[model samples]
Target chain A: FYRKALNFNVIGRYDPKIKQLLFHTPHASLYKWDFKKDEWNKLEYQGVLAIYLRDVSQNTNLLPKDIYNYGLIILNRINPDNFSMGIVPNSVVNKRKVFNAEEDTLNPLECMGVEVKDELVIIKNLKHEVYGIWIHTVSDRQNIYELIKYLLENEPKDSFA
Target chain B: LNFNVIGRYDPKIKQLLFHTPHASLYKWDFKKDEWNKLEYQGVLAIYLRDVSKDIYNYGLIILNRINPDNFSMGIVPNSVVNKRKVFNAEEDTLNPLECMGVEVKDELVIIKNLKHEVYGIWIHTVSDRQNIYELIKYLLENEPKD
Candidate 1:
């Protein structure tokens, strides 16, 4: 009666980084991006692959100083196009999976979807300029601490173990 | 009449007939007196710089895109339209609503820096002031129609 579902794209700078346990299960493990070993080195094209969690040193706020980073596109509902990518969302570029992270917490399970624990939730770099958050869902998840007190009294405050 | 341009402005070339990523920003949503709902919340135009070059745009700054803070929204004709010398991109050194922070409620206002997700999507399509006064008389009669 429950499965993973975490969809958020907090902006700044990113290339290819995404993880939601690869929804639409069927031995999921597709990937791309290998700028001469830059990483994400598996492949076969998986439609709608988006994994960008912002901040990669240049650390510009609000779209790389006025917009021009070209990153942020997440739409995964894997497997036989998972119910037609949910009522018509289209994206099965071949069963997508691309991971590149600096700050991210994602999930959108559909591939037999819902592991329970293997990497439940973890993506911390704290060392801040204003960033901190932890959230999980699959039904009654676990110890969320009232969603970190509504994002530290309403957003921004991080250092989750 | 203070700036409030969004999109269609080029009676001949006053500017912005089309430039893809062109956006905007400026806020002060006083509950609902409405500044076009704080400017469609995705900003395309709502600016005011030194009054009468474009016919009286008293400190209207709304940018969520289109390189406003860096210049693509030209305003340099003796640049100083005295609405307290408007300033707000962090209040341009604490002018704090000094026309710069972009404050004017009797006639309505929504200014300050630019790009709050394009002024929060131009304050949700800024409830249209009859098309923001027909986009400010079609950007002041698209300027070059003189």
Candidate 2:
């Protein structure tokens, strides 16, 4: 009950433990197949998002009852990789209806400050802390570093890979 | 860690799980009372070797064997064990792998089972690397409160 053409690296197969497959992909625009809606849900984030499998019982703790037992794909770009593992109860998943990004207010990027100059875009949290940099494109590739440093000091690079 | 020249034992199950890097599971056929070799392939033995500390008190807990590198343990029913395998919970040491138990303190991952026995352990995140300590504590407390 998942979407096709997913461009993520699958870490493992279906686990009886978590009851789903574990996957990972670079954060930009991520999507997960919504079994309830039979569509893709735009999982908003900006860094790395690890999609770990989880039980699909009933998560009264997170979402609706019909959304129960869906995959627990957590998004965390700040915490340690291992520490960012979030949880979803079957009761929560069971209750979630189809996710509508246009109707949701939990997107993290728009909540940040944006500074744009030329093809370089820098995004930061509401506190004005540097969150990430978005570059339009780079042809020379090697000189990408120069462009990145231009965006966020000598920090350089946005994992354009 | 019984160092038999042929292979290694579960130390808890007392069966030959693996003999070498490339081999199949050698289980003791209780029916025939003879060693029956399974064709699926061998199970790797990850030890909790802290013979120096009292931690020699350890056992072997089987996680997933589907992949050699991507193994796991300790989560809940979503762990190396099945609910059926975990029975009356108590602190014992006779047969560790029979009854599943999990203990994580400091950086060590300790699993216990039969006779309140302890299954194997991970000095680091040998199995589950996630921060499920809180979840584990919750499960432990939420369980029969044992």
Candidate 3:
């Protein structure tokens, strides 16, 4: 399993300022990679109690530009265990501590709910913007290389490619 | 079409300031009396800019909304409406929105510079836009925080 599950296809680079790892596996996902220890760590869930990015530093990308349809999403304390409703199919019974990142799956987006943080608090900054869905669970950390392994193993089905 | 023009997006202050005719800042009770107006402020929304780079031009760009006050918009980062990455206009045929129990009436779209916000939430037969606001308030207030 180590040979087949050690590494996954990666497509991202490191940020100079925030120090968080950014990857674009079909979508832009955030993570932490440890070069010295060769391990991974969870996203900033603590010290930075709260985070606020104003739609692209006065001039930016997606959400910051489209203020009418975009808003702030407070993704904190969101855990899979907090979920009362069943997100996965009802048939499958979850009974494993360390789910070996499966080899055959789409990208690791689905794992967002299962792997890292648990809660995502979405609040609309604009009034007319449509209601965005709230997703806050991850099956649930950081050695980016190992993180890639988890993503590779537990790839989501509904990925673009 | 757009919500009765009461507010506008102001970049100078980095907020969606409203210029309402009444005293209430947020919402007002239309069916009832004049004193029933509610006080709500702030503007929050998401945008999906075009960044296609493939033969079919079919690609998804992920935008992160990191405001601790409001929730973020959720969508698959790399999914598209059509196989050929044609956004805007008539060619767009894919609605990439996922909600708990709402089949968004119109195929929710992401036009380049158009301002879009939550219009309504349809629960089976009933479509309540105002009621949904209450629900959002409940979640914001009720949910336990660290």
Tens-place lDDT per residue, model 3, B31-140, is 54221211111233222222323221111111122321222222222223222234543433353322212222231111111112222211211223333333333322
User: What's the i-RMS for candidate 1 in angstroms?
Assistant: 20.3
DockQ of 1: 0.01
Worst 10 residues of 2 chain A by lDDT: A152-161
Scored by TM-score, the top model is 1
DockQ of each: 0.01, 0.01, 0.01
Query: What does candidate 3's lDDT look like per residue over A37-148, in tens digits?
Result: 5433223221112111111123325332111111112222211111011122111112111242352132121211222233322111111111222222222123222333
What does candidate 1's lDDT look like per residue over B1-146, in tens digits? 21224423422223232222222232334464322222211234434333322523322234322112222333221123232245324444453322112232322322333222112222212345334434443443333222
Candidate 1, superposed: residue stretches over 4 Å from native: A1-129, A132-146, A149-161, B1-59, B63-121, B125-133, B137-139, B142-146
TM-score of 3: 0.16
Ranked by lDDT from best down, the candidates are: 2, 1, 3
State the fnat of candidate 3 relative to the true structure: 0.00
Compose the digit string of candidate 2's lDDT tens values, residues A1-161.
Answer: 12334654433332333444433344321223345655433223223334343444443465442222213233323221221222333222222223445423352212223344343333343223332222212332224333322332322111221
- How high is the CA lDDT of each candidate model? 0.26, 0.31, 0.22
